[PDB]
Design a protein around this ligand. Structure first.
Ligand SMILES: [Cl-]
Ligand SMILES: [Cl-]
Ligand SMILES: [Cl-]
Ligand SMILES: [Cl-]
Ligand SMILES: [Cl-]
Ligand SMILES: [Cl-]
Ligand SMILES: [Cl-]
Ligand SMILES: [Cl-]
Ligand SMILES: [Cl-]
Ligand SMILES: [Cl-]
Ligand SMILES: [Cl-]
Ligand SMILES: [Cl-]
Lengths: 316, 318, 317, 317, 319, 317
C-alpha cells in the first residue's frame, strides 16, 4: 500500500545536491587510476542450449587489478551488432543471470552481464579497512577512496570500454540497463562515460541516501542504519554521509546527456519512490519516468514493453 | 520458543563422524607458519572511560596477511601480574567494540582484550574476495581453505594470545578465552591451535558440524551457506564449499583442545542448533562440562553467567 | 527449512491410486463433449516490440462453448516450426505472460500460452452449483461433471488440436510445458492426448490431493481445507475427494507415453515434495526428475538449462 | 492502532458521488430482468436442537434463473411475526450461519440468512467473461451487466419479496441486517426496495471503492489492486471503476429512506473508517453511526446491545 | 496444519497421573475453607433488550471472602428451569459475555456466566506471594494453597451451590459448560461437586501441564516457560510442577461421574490435541469426544449442534 | 523506522497536564499510609562469584504491609559509599538482575535492585477489585486508591528510606536509575522524595497515557486498550484515565528538583518518543535528554557512557 510522498509531491521533489567541492576531481582521479590498468580482456566459449546465439565468459582487469567477469552473449550472425551492458540487482545474481543475458542476445543485442564485485561474481581486491555492518553497503564507508562502490562504478565504465573495443560491436549503438542496484550502475556509467548512447533504469538504488535511511522500510538501505547503530561516534555518521555523497545519483545525474528511461512503483519499500523521483528530477536530458501505482520493487510487465520499445527505437 | 532438534537423550549421544581431510593438520601448521612470519608490532594507546579502578587502552597488532587487528584492552588499576581474558564477539554483533563489557570484566579482576573480528566489529581484513558469494562473511572465499574468511580470523585469535601473554602485567599462566556463538567458536579454535590459553568458556559455539547445520538451522547466519548454493548451482561448488568448511569446523578442531572447557546450550536455540553444539562438545577429549538450558535459546543466559564467573574465578582469578 | 519426507522416502513414495471404476469412461465422455464443440479458431495480429517474431491473439471454442484465449508467437521465418503450448500458474498470469511467450518464439518455438478459465483470461461458461471456498480449487467440487478443472483440462486438450492444425507448425514436434498448475496441465494434456511429443513440468500441482491437504503449508491446496471448514457435513468431504480423484495426477500419470522431464525443490511449501514425487513415481514412460535441495516453489535457474537442453534434443533437433 | 483520517476529519468526509448518468436506468432495468424470473420458492423442514423455533431450508429463483438458498427459522407461535433477512460476510459463512439464524428467531424474529452466490451457498449461473484476480470482487468487473454483485444485490431484493409474501410474516415489520459485505447488501436492498422498514449495517463493505483500494490494509478490497497488477491496460482501470460505481454505497446511499443504524471501529483495516463514514454521510434519512475507538473488523459487543434495542423498538414492539 | 501426535496415537495417549499422595486431602481442606464462607448472594435486575428473558447481576461470597459476580439470565416463564453455569476463556471475557448468556436463557436455560477472578470480572482477595510471569498462570505457583486457580475452582463450586438454591431452578437439571479455561472449570467443578448432572467442555485447558509446556506453540501455557526463564532455580521448576499437579485435569478427571461431552480440533496450537486427549482418556464415565480435523482453538460450528443436542437430551427434555 | 512526530516537533511537545485538583493530597495521603508501616528491614548474606563485592538479599515492609525484596551489593571496602536504587523493566527481571546489580557495586556504588511487586519478585498484598486485561497495567485501574502502581511508587520511596539509613551508605550521594518502567519509577521516586541526589532514566514509561494508547505500537501500554475492549462502558474509560492521571509522569515531573539525565530512541515503539519528550518537557530542573535516532526500546551503548559519566560526576568523584 502507498506510504511515501503523494504523487503531486514526488513530481516536485528535488533535494539539494550533497556533492562536495572536490566531487569532479575525485572522479577524474578515479578514472585515471582505472586507466592505469590494462584491460587484458579474455573471451572463452560457453556451451548453452540455444540456437542463434553464441555465449562466452568474459573477463577483464579493472581498478585495483581486480579480475571482473560475466557472461557475454552474441547474436549468431554477421555484425556490427547493437550492444548492451546489463547490471544486476544487489545480492540478486544467480548463475550470473545467464538465461536473461541469452534472451537479450536473442532480441538482437550483444549483451554482457557484468557481475558485481563479490556479489554475482568477480574479484574484489580492495581491502576492508575496518568494521562495517553485515553486507556491502558499508564496506570502506569512512573514505571515498576505500568505499565499495568506487571500484564497482569504475568496473561499469571499464565494461563499456571493453565492449566498445570488440569489432563485432557497433560503438554507436550501446545501451546500459539494469534495475535497482543495476539501475544505479547504469546511470553512474552514463554519467561517467559517453560511450553509452541510452540508459534504462528500473527503480534505481543508491540515490538520495540521507532521505533513504529515513524512509525505506526494507534492506539494503537499512545497512547504513545498522552501521551507525554499531559505530555511534557522531563524526562517523558525518563522515559516512560525506563518503556516500560521491556515489549518490542525485549528484551524478547532472552529468547524464544520454536519452534515459526510468520506472518506479509507488508501493516500493526498498527503493522509495521519493529517492527515485529525486534522481530523475536531477536529470537534465532526454528523459521519461514511467509510474506504476500497484507495483513495488519487482518485475513490472508494462515497463518491460516500454523498455523494449525504447531500446529498439534507439539501438535496433 | 519450543523444542525442535534431536531429543535430549539423542543430543547427548550425537557425535558426528569427523570430516577432516588427510591434510587437515598440515594446513594448520602451514597457516600458523605464515602467521609467524608477520611481526606483531603491537601498539597501545590510552582510552578514556568513566570508570575507577580500571585503565583502558586501544590495542592494535599485525596478523596474517599483514592485517591490523584491534580492540579495547582493559586492565585493573592495581599492581599485577593479572590473570587475563581474550573475549571474542558474536557474528555482526559488536557495538562500539563491546567496551562496556570489556571494562566490566576488568572490574572483575581480569586484564581483558576484546578482539574485534575482521570487518565486523572492527579490524582490517586484507584478504581479497576471489569471487561471488552470498550476503555476509560466511561464504567469502569459500572455494579454497587458503582464501576462506575464517582462516585469517582464527589466526588473529591465536595472535591475540601471543600478544597478550608478552605483556609484563599479564600472568602468562592464567589466560582464558571466552565468547558466545561466533565468539565461542573462536575461543575453541584458539585453544585447539594454541597452548597459550589455560581455560575455555564457550556459550553455544557456532562454526560446528556445517553439513548438519545447513539442514537444521532455522535462522541466519548458517543459512548464508544455503543462500550461496542457491546463487551458485554447480554440484562441484557444493562439494568444494563443504571441503573448505571442514578445515574450520569445530568437530575437527575440538580433539586438539587440552584445556578445561565450559560450554552452554539452550534447547530452543534456532541459530546454533543444540545438535551442532553437542557435536562440538562430544568431540572434545578434555576436562569438560556442558550446561543445558531447556527454556533458553541464542541469548544471554543468567544462570550460565554465574557458572561462567565461578569457573573463571576458580581457574584464573583465584 | 527441510520439512517433508526424507529424500530416500520420497524416491519410493507411490501412494495407491484413488481413481474410481468409471475413471476411463469419465474422460472418454468428457472428450466426446469437447469434440461436439467446433473449434472455430480466430487469429489477430498483436504488435509487440521485437524483431524476428510475429505475435497473435488466438481464441477458440472449447467445452461448454467457452471462448479460450492466449498469445501465440511465431518465429518470423520459414517453417514448419516445432511448437510449445505453455500453461501458466494458479492466479499467476500477468498480461498473459506475453513477454515469456515471445521469448520462447525467439528460442525457435511457435508458442501459445493458454490462459486458464477466469484466471489469466478466457471465458468460463460453467455455472457455480453452490457455495465454495474463496478461489477456484473448490468451484463445483461436489461433482466430477461440474468441477473447475474438467473444463480447464479439456481446454488444454483443445489447445493442442488447434496448434496442431497450423500450417507453420510441425505437428510431430509439439511440446507442452508449465510449472505448478501449469505443469499439471502439461501432464494431463499429454495423458489425454497423443498430440504432444514431450512434456516438461516444473513442480506439478493437482497431485495426491489427500496427502496434499495434510502437508501443504501455503495456498492453494489449502482452499480444500477451507471448504471443509465452511461445509462440515462428513459426506461432503467424502464426495469432495471422490470428485478430485478424476483430476489427480497420480491417476492420470499412467497414461503418459511421452518422455517427461520434471523438477522439484525440496523446501517447496506450495507443491510439497511428496506430492510431486507421487506424480513422478506413477509415470511409466521415459522420465527424469531433477531435485533441487535448496529451492522451493520458484524459478530454478539450473532447471532452466535442463529444460532448454531437453526441448532442444526432442524438438528443435 | 489508529491509521485512517482522524475522527473529526472522518465525520466530515463525504466523497463526491461517482454515479454515472445512467445509474438509475441500469437499476430499473436490472430490477425488470429480475421480475421476469418467477420466484417459485420451496420450503423444507430442517431438524435443529432447539425449542420454540422451527427451521427450514428456503430456496427461490432469482436473477439469471439462479437457485438461491439459506436457512429460514421461525418462532414456534402464532404470527404475524416481525422478520429479518440477514446477509453474511465475504467468504465468512460456515454451515449457512444456522446457529445465528436460530438465535435471531429466538429473539422473536422470523429470520432468513440468504446465502451469497458461490460463497456460503446458492447457485451463480452468471458466466465468467474473462480473467480476474482470485476471489469474487473482480469477476465480470469489465461490465456493469456482468459484474458479480449485480446478481447478488438482485438476490437480496428478491429475498425480501419472498419473505414478505409469507403468511406468517408481518410485511410491515421487516428489517435487513448484516456485517461488512452483509452490511452492504442490507443497505443496497433497502436502497433498491421499500420492503424493509429498517436497516442495521455493521461496518459496510463495497463503499467508496476509489479510496478503499488506497487505504485498505487487508483483503478483500485489495483484490481490485491484484486485478490491476495482472491486467495493466490503463483503460481497464478506468473501465473497472466505472463498473464498480454502479454498486458503490456512496451512490446507493441517497436512496435509503429507512431508519438506519451503523457501526464502525476505528482500527478496522478491512473496511477502513473513511469508507464507512463515506457511506453514512451520503445517507439522507433517520440515521445513527456508532463509533468504537478500540475495535476493528469484528464482533462489537456494545453495538449488539444497540442493534437489539434498535430492532426491538422499530419491529418487535 | 497438523503438528501433534497422530490421531491413532492420541486415542492411546493416557499419561500417568501426577497427583501427590495428599491430592484428595488438599481438596477436602479447600472445600472446607470454602464452606466456612457464607455465600450471602445478591440479585439485581439488569436491563437488556430482549423479550422473554429476565437478566440479573448475581454476586456471592467465596473462598478468601472474595465477591464473585456474573450475569444470570432466566427464561421469563414459570419453571422450575433446567440451568447452566457457563465458564469463560482465559482473558477472553467481553462485557461479561452477556449476549451469549441471554441466548442460552432463550434456548430454555437459567444461565449464570461466572466471571473468573480478576479476568472477566470478580474480586480476588488472594495476595501475590512473589514474582511471577506476565499473566495469571504463574500467580502463586510456588504453593498449592496460594495458586491462582485454587480460588477459581472453589468459586466454580460455590456457583453451583448458589444456583442450585434458587427456587426457579431444578437442582437435578444443572449443567456446567465452557471452552478451554472454561471447559477446564466445567470439568473441575464436576469433579469437585456432584451438583451438576452433565458436562460440556470444548478443548479444555489446564491439562497435562508437563507435556503442555513442551508442545504448546502459543499462549497461555507458555507463561509457565516464561516463569522458569525468569526464575532459574532448578528447585523452583520442581515445586512449580508439584503445585500444578493439584489442579491438572489428568488428576481430577477420575472424579467425574457425570455424562461428559468434549471437543478437540487437530490444529489447535493453544490446547494441543494430546493435552486434551490426556484429559479425556482419564475420565471413566459416560463420555464422548468429537474430533475435528480442520479446526483449532476456535468456535466449531458442527460441535455447537452436538452441544445443543446433548444439553437438550439431558436437561431441557428429560430428568 | 521513524514513525512518531518529527524531532523538531518532539522538542516542543508539552501536553497540558491532566492532574486533578486532589493530586497533591492524594500523594500526601498515600505517603502517610506508607509511613504507618514500620520498615523492619532484614539482611541476608548471598554468595556470588565476585571479588571486591559483598552481596545480600534485602527485604523490607512497605505500603499495605507488603514485603519488598531485592539484591543489595556493596563494595568490599570501607565506606561510606555512594548508592543507587535500580529499578527494572516491566516483566523484564530475570533472577533479580543480580549480574547487573553486582556490576554497579564494582563500579563503586552500594546498589539495591528493588523487585517490583509480583514481577521480578516482592509480595503484593493489594486485592484485585475486579476484572482487568491480562497484565499489571490495569489492575485496580478503577480507583486511584487500588491501582497497581500506587503500592509500587510507595515501594520505591521506601527503598530510598531504607538504603539511606544504612551506616555504610552516604545519604547525601544516592541516585535512582532505570529504563522504561524502571525510568518512571526513578522519576516518580525523585518526585515523591528528596532523598535521591540525581536521576537517570532511559526512555521512561507511564507517561502521557492519553497519547500513548493512540501511538504505542507494542505492549504494554496497549494493555489499556485491551482493557477498554473488554469493559465498554464509556464511564469506565473516563474513570480509568482519571486514575491514571495520578501516576502519569507529565504530572509528577514538576516535582523533580534533582539533576536528571534521560534518553530516547526515535524508533522506540514501546515508549514512543513523544511520550518521553512529554515527560522531559515537564521537568524544570538541571536536565538533559540524549536523543538516539537509530535506536529503539533497547540497550543504547552510547548512552551507557553518558550515564556512567553523569553518575561519576554527581556521586563518585
Ligand atoms: Cl571504513
Ligand atoms: Cl517492494
Ligand atoms: Cl571463493
Ligand atoms: Cl534463538
Ligand atoms: Cl459444488
Ligand atoms: Cl515455497
Ligand atoms: Cl470481466
Ligand atoms: Cl481489522
Ligand atoms: Cl509464588
Ligand atoms: Cl489454534
Ligand atoms: Cl478496578
Ligand atoms: Cl522498540
Amino acid at each position: 500500500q502507498l506510504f511515501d510522498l503523494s504523487l503531486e509531491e514526488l513530481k516536485k521533489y528535488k533535494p539539494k545536491k550533497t556533492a562536495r567541492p572536490d566531487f569532479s576531481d575525485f572522479w577524474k582521479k578515479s578514472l585515471e587510476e582505472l586507466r592505469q590498468v590494462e584491460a587484458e580482456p579474455t573471451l572463452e566459449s560457453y556451451d548453452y542450449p540455444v540456437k542463434g546465439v553464441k555465449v562466452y565468459r568474459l573477463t577483464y582487469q579493472s581498478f585495483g587489478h581486480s579480475k571482473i567477469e560475466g557472461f557475454y552473449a552474441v547474436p549468431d550472425q554477421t555484425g556490427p551488432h547493437p550492444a548492451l551492458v546489463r547490471f544486476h540487482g544487489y545480492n540478486a545474481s544467480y548463475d550470473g543471470g545467464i538465461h536473461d543475458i541469452v534472451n537479450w542476445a536473442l532480441h538482437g543485442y550483444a549483451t554482457f552481464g557484468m557481475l558485481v564485485r563479490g556479489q554475482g561474481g568477480s574479484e574484489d581486491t580492495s581491502v576492508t579497512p575496518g568494521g562495517h555492518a553485515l553486507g556491502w553497503m558499508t564496506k570502506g564507508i569512512l573514505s571515498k577512496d576505500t568505499y565499495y562502490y568506487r571500484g564497482v562504478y569504475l568496473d561499469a565504465v571499464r565494461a563499456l570500454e571493453v565492449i566498445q573495443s570488440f569489432p563485432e560491436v557497433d560503438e554507436h549503438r550501446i545501451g546500459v540497463i539494469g534495475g535497482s542496484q543495476g539501475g544505479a550502475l547504469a546511470i553512474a556509467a552514463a554519467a561517467l562515460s559517453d560511450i553509452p548512447k541510452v540508459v534504462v533504469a528500473d527503480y534505481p538504488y543508491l540515490s538520495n541516501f540521507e532521505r533513504a535511511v529515513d524512509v525505506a522500510l526494507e534492506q539494503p538501505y537499512l545497512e547504513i542504519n545498522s552501521y551507525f547503530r554499531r559505530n555511534s561516534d557522531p563524526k562517523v555518521e558525518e563522515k559516512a554521509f560525506e563518503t556516500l555523497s560521491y556515489f549518490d545519483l542525485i549528484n551524478l545525474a547532472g552529468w547524464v546527456k544520454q536519452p534515459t528511461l526510468m520506472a518506479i512503483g509507488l508501493i516500493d519499500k526498498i527503493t522509495p519512490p521519493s529517492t527515485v523521483f529525486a534522481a530523475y528530477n536531477h536529470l537534465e536530458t532526454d528523459k521519461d519516468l514511467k509510474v506504476y501505482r500497484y507495483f513495488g520493487h519487482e518485475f513490472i510487465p508494462a515497463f518491460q514493453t516500454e523498455k523494449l520499445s525504447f531500446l529498439q527505437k534507439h539501438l535496433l
